[PDB]
Design a protein around this nucleic acid. Structure first.
Lengths: 207, 62, 122, 142
RNA sequence: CGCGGCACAUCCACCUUGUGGUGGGUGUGGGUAGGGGAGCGUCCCUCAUUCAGCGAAGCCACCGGGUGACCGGUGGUGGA
RNA sequence: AUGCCGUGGUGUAAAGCGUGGCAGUGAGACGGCGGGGGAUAAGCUCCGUACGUCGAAAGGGAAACAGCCCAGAUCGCCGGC
RNA sequence: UAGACGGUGAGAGCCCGGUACGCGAAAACCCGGCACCUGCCUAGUAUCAAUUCCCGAGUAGCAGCGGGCCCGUGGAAUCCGCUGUGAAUCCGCCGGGACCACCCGGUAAGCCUAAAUACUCCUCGAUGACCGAUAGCGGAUUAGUACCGUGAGGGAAUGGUGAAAAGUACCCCGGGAGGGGAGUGAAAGAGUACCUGAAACCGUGUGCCUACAAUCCGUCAGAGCCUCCUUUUCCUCUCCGGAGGAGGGUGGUGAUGGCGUGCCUUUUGAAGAAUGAGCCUGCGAGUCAGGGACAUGUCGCAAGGUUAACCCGUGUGGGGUAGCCGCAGCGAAAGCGAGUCUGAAUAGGGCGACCCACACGCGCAUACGCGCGUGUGAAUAGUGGCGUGUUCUGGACCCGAA
């Protein structure tokens, strides 16, 4: 409910009270399931193309007339059952996305975050830099010393000095700004890292 | 892409405040001498659609 | 996503042929010809287990008749007598006795003869 | 997590693949006849041999006006439970509560026991509405 | 009828005394078009886990396994 | 005589009715009993029956046999009636 | 600030080419700053009178035959074209759905006008819950080639050695091809006809049956041989083994007997002398778009719910209330409104309200429940998303007519 971690190359800083949105929420897995599936659906590009009759060159000729041939009722050389033919009910390039309610998305997200908080998986930080320049090495040591896990979700904001630079090249580590805070990432990552500014804007936005 | 409603159905049937459909009976516009005022009273009104064809009509109007 | 359905076909295909070994001609070589024969083979087995039961009854009965006539008594009167005595013994083991131990068979005949009432009147 | 995440029982019923054998549905598996139905879905309008019910029946009498200035409805009983304290009533407050549509004039019903003594800013009250309003002790506007 | 094993409704007693199951009893269980319910298998993606050039996949044979769509294991070929 | 409507008791896991969703059938044959056309006819044809069976039902028996007789297979049994 | 892909002898952050990131323009060229260059302007504003003149001419409008506008000639506006007649210059003209009057809006019959928008042969870069050589465009291979056709046009099939060619020197059969022995190679079970090498098919060897016997070519009974194998008398040669034999038991063959009219399609009715299939391999037929529509299961909220378009942002997140369905219906409509309509009234009747295990106060009733307020907690809901089944329009399960 109200806990913080240490600071890199320092001592300790934080002590920010968190509301009920990040702890006292009985998350519903059906809701979370529906939202997540919708997200992976929308992430699909819809390039699943094909080609059928009318797009294939030729095939308008009707050889082998209908009596005295001993052959089948041909009608066209590009018909499905002939090789080199078209595709029946093929994968037309669907562009699709399971448009959902904002209430469902928000409830799922705060639910998952409340599960991580209940399980002690929140690592609220103040910053992450040796003053100005980035350091993959330093962030690796800090995060490996704090979280001791593989998959990490990081929330900083629009600060590219080292927040959105030191975390790169770190297998299993993803980073985003609060406004782009989805649930798939949250449910995947265990030890979720938040900046103070991230909590300030996020909490204020959600009252 | 977008539905259509059968026009003649929309011009003959009227949905009420609830799940019911009515028909204006009017077999009384051509010849009325041999028809008595009794038969015209029988025809006069808006009766309820028979349940043996509401299952078709509701899709005709929707 | 082209799946290339061959594997699914090959499973039941080889599964049937390896069980189809023993038939003549194409019946033990080709899937579509072997498949048909197995349909009729299994219907035959289905009814033939029942027939097998009945046929074994008939063989057992016939042998019982032979032993009985060697003991100067018919099957009809033998079974009637065994019922009157109360000898709830099957025909299977009765025939086995009729072969491996004719003496005990004859003893059972004497029991049945004693158990019969008198004649064809009631 | 995702390895625990699962759906609610009763949703996601198996798609019925049709032409996939006899154990599932059949060789024709739905169009189980040999007439038209085996090739084409039939117009629901078209009966098949007789004058359609549409043509058979008479055209519904009457007409629709273009200039039908329809008003929305405010139930005075709903006012009673919504504003038992009275205070102030008006278009903006009613839509602020969400009891009535916006951008339109509203009438008041005689449905409901009104006790809250409050004036009502609205249009085209029925006589029973005025009787209830002044019986409580309020006043109509126009 | 007898001697045994599965299944759906129902009756009864228990576990959340129908979430769904557990124990017992009666009756039920031929079936096309066709309705309903639950299932088998293949390919791809995600997550977790995990075997693998000390030999994966595919293929061949063999021995077994499930009520079914089918599976597992062993051996050989081959080499991701 | 049968048959039919309706009522009151009795008996039967239950069928029925209304209400919605999704299909099929919309060519029927024979036999039994009553009828018309036809010649006192037909493996003829058009009807009726809360008559069945086949159709969609395997098995026994009728020599073999879809429609008649008996008999409605959950599976197994080298058990009986 | 380099874990993007890839290559390199088997799966590479640190072996390579590369990426991140940061550099890099003589000459040409698009945009862009500046100069020259070019070009407009010696004021028409304020006020008043309206006697004068102008304000788009074979035009508008009108009549006729048509198009098109929700609008099929219908009462037919406006717009467009054709043919004859043929107006006005502000006290004018057009329009406001035949039309007249009043009111209002605006001044046609000259021209130019960027933005938002539509499309990608073609050129860089990038992705892909798209195929991976009978699929993808037909074209990974001499591809719109070969080939067919006088011609318009039609229109094929063929990928894989091994990491490396290390391409079997030499010797022996043989006319050669081809093969063999050596040998390279990890491997030749990797030899140009080359990864794996399936099935139909041909063929060699071998255990069993078969030349006196008729049946969809099997099943069930079932003899006796043969392969294998356990226990055992026993071979005691026994610190070895199962030689052989009996018996027992897997997997073949199966003498001989019973039983039995092949699949599918379509049919009242089929094994068919009713149709289709030579066999194998691969491919091949109920799917998808739409805030479509009815019903349903389940999941958000709760008299609400929901956003579309579009904006911002990066993994598809947050905004965005215009709009829709529900919220009171009846009635042709005016209009009325928990009633309303028809109708002289409505007594009646059509659509919709409000169904109590019931207490307080209370009319009704012996009891049974009707009712007005408060209540023993009396009866309660749609909406949106995701699946299912159906359906409309989309080629719509698929193939084929002339």
């Amino acid at each position: 409910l109200k806990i913080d971690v240490k600071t890199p190359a320092g001592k300790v800083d934080g002590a920010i009270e968190l509301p009920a949105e990040l702890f006292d929420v009985p998350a519903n897995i059906a809701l979370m399931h529906q939202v997540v599936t919708a997200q992976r659906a929308a992430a699909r590009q819809g390039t699943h193309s094909t080609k059928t009759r009318g797009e294939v060159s030729g095939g308008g000729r009707k050889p082998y007339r209908q009596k005295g041939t001993g052959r089948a009722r041909q009608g066209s050389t590009r018909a499905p059952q002939f090789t080199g033919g078209g595709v029946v009910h093929g994968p037309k390039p669907r562009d699709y996305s399971q448009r959902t309610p904002k209430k469902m998305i928000a409830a799922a997200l705060r639910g998952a975050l409340s599960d991580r908080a209940r399980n002690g998986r929140i690592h609220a930080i103040t910053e992450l830099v040796e003053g100005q320049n980035p350091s993959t090495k330093s962030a690796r040591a800090f995060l490996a010393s704090l979280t001791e896990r593989k998959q990490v979700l990081v929330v900083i904001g629009r600060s590219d000095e080292a927040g959105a630079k030191s975390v790169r090249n770190l297998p299993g580590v993803h980073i985003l700004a609060p406004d782009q805070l989805n649930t798939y990432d949250v449910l995947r990552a265990d030890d979720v890292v938040f900046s103070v500014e991230a909590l300030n804007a996020y909490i204020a936005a959600n009252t | 892409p977008k539905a259509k409603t059968h026009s003649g159905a929309s011009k003959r049937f009227r949905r009420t405040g609830t799940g019911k459909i009515v028909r204006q009976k009017a077999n009384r516009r051509h010849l009325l001498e041999h028809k008595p005022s009794t038969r015209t009273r029988r025809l006069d009104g808006r009766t309820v659609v028979a349940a043996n064809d509401t299952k078709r009509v509701t899709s005709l109007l929707n | 996503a082209r799946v290339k359905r061959a594997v699914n076909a090959h499973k039941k295909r080889r599964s049937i042929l390896k069980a189809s070994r023993g038939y003549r001609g194409q019946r033990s070589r080709l899937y579509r010809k072997a498949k048909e024969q197995q349909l009729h083979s299994l219907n035959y087995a289905y009814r033939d287990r029942r027939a097998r039961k009945g046929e074994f009854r008939k063989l057992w009965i016939a042998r019982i008749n032979a032993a009985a006539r060697l003991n100067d008594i018919t099957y009809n009167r033998l079974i009637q007598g065994l019922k009157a005595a109360g000898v709830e013994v099957d025909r299977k083991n009765l025939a086995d006795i009729a072969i491996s131990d004719p003496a005990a068979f004859t003893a059972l005949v004497d029991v049945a003869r004693a158990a019969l009432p008198e004649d064809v009147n009631a | 997590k995702l390895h625990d995440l699962r759906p609610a029982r009763g949703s996601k019923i198996a798609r019925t693949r049709v032409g996939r054998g006899d154990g599932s549905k059949g060789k024709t598996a739905g169009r189980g006849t040999k007439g038209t139905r085996a090739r084409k879905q039939v117009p629901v309008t078209f009966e098949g041999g007789q004058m359609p019910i549409h043509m058979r029946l008479p055209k519904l009498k009457g007409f629709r006006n273009r200039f039908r200035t329809e008003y929305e409805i405010v139930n005075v009983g709903d006012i009673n439970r919504l504003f038992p304290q009275g205070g102030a009533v008006g278009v903006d407050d009613l839509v602020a509560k969400g009891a009535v549509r916006k951008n339109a004039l509203v009438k008041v019903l005689g449905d409901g026991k009104l006790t809250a003594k409050v004036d009502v800013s609205a249009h085209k009250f029925s006589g029973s509405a005025r009787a209830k309003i002044t019986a409580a002790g309020g006043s109509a506007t126009e």
